[PDB]
Structures are given as C-alpha cells and as structure tokens.
Design a protein around this nucleic acid. Structure first.
Ligand SMILES: [Ca+2]
Lengths: 96, 96
DNA sequence: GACAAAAAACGTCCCG
DNA sequence: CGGGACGTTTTTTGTC
C-alpha cells in the first residue's frame, strides 16, 4: 500500500536509487560549508571537503542550475532559495 | 511518520535531487510497462517506450540486480518485490 | 553474447 | 577566482 511514513518512502526509493542518501548527504554538506565560508571558490571548497576539484565543480554547477548557489567572480554564495532549502534539510536530515 | 514530514522530505528532494528523481521516474515507468505487458522482451519493450534497445538493456539489468524483474527465455516479468514497489511509490510518483 | 565506437567522467593546466 | 580546454580513463551506446 501507499507509503505511510518517511522510513517507508526512503526504503522504497533506495530500491530505484541505491545511493540516494549518499548524494543527499554530499549535497547537504556542500550547502552547509558554503553557508559557513561564502564567498568560497572551487579549489578551497574541494580541499576543505576532501572531494576532487572536478567532482565538486560538477556538483556546484548543478546546484547553480537549481538556483541554490550563485557563482560569481569572487566565488560562490547561497541564494535565497539555498538558505531556505538548507534550513528545511537541517530538520529533515535528522529523521533520514 | 507524519504526512507533513513526508511532504517536507519530498519537496526538499524535488529541489536538491531532481536529476536523481528523473532516473527514478524512468525506471518506475519501465516497471509499469512490464506490469501491463509481461512477459515482454527488450526489443518489444524498447519500441513500446521511446528508447533504444541498448539503453533499455542497461536499465533492465539494473532492475534485475535489485530483484525487481525476472528475465526468462520468454522475456521479463516483475518479482514480488517489483509489484510491492509499484504499490508503495504509486502516489508520490504522480506528485513529482 | 561479441566487437566497435562514442560519450562521459575526470585530473590538471590555461588565461585574464 | 571562474570559464575554457586538453589529454586520459571509464562507462555507455550502437549494431547484429
Ligand atoms: Ca512474500
């Protein structure tokens, strides 16, 4: 029957997307680290999170396309949408 | 557990993970089409969807590895786990 | 299945 | 600092 809870939904979603929680957590950590250090560039942010610059660059370009981060001459900052999303994820990620 | 915490999770997923939600929907569509037409083989199923045999064959091999479909000499059918997954995700998968 | 090729991913370096 | 890009490696795709 239709998923009644959050644990039930995630367990069903992992069948189609086995590393859903991994992607979620990695993107959440990028947004947290930008909120703490903005403006920050791809070289500093990759080093601080221990992610390869090329991988981090792809993830932040994705977040920019979703209008969550602004990528400017002096580096990256969160958008209004990014701050709001990060506040929602602080709550949700404790129950995931 | 509550409806609102689940709706919060789903709305956060739509902003942070739309690339992952797209993959999940395409794989969910494959399971729906198999439920309708099983047993069906990769040539007929790829034609029925708008995709190449080779792309389908990649997705179907994933679904077999997750124990959601069985591949027999007469084509593909859903497992028990596949039928269950379609009932659990049915409503969320329309509200995306 | 095989066999080939194209596309994607990735690690660095290039510049102003 | 980011956009652009080159060379290499890996994964996906076409074809039958
Ligand atoms: Ca059973």
């Amino acid at each position: 029957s239709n998923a009644a809870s959050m644990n039930q939904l995630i367990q069903a979603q992992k069948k189609l997307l086995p590393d859903l929680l991994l992607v979620m957590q990695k993107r959440f950590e990028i947004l947290q680290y930008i909120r703490l250090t903005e403006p920050i560039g791809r070289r500093s942010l990759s080093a601080s999170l221990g992610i390869s610059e090329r991988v981090l660059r792809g993830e932040v370009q994705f977040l920019k396309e979703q209008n969550l981060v602004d990528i400017k001459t002096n580096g990256m900052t969160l958008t209004e949408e990014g701050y709001e999303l990060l506040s929602v994820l602080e709550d949700t990620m404790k129950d995931v």
